Amino acid sequence: YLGRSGGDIIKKMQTLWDEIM
């Protein structure tokens, strides 16, 4: 919603925890 808000949020959450833990 308004310049790809929904798609980009799920992509960044996935790698936040993939790379740290």
Question: How would you characterize the overall build of this protein?
Answer:
The N and C termini lie far apart (30 Å). The chain is rod-shaped, with a radius of gyration of 10 Å. With 21 residues, the protein is mostly helical. It has one helix spanning 5-20. May disrupt the normal intermolecular interactions of the cytoplasmic domain of band 3 and thereby facilitate the invagination of the red cell membrane which is necessary for the formation of the parasitophorous vacuole. This is Ring-infected erythrocyte surface antigen. It is found in: Cell membrane. It is classed as immune system.
Concise structural overview:
This protein has 1 helix and no strands. It is mainly alpha-helical and 21 residues long. The protein is rod-shaped and about 30 Å long.
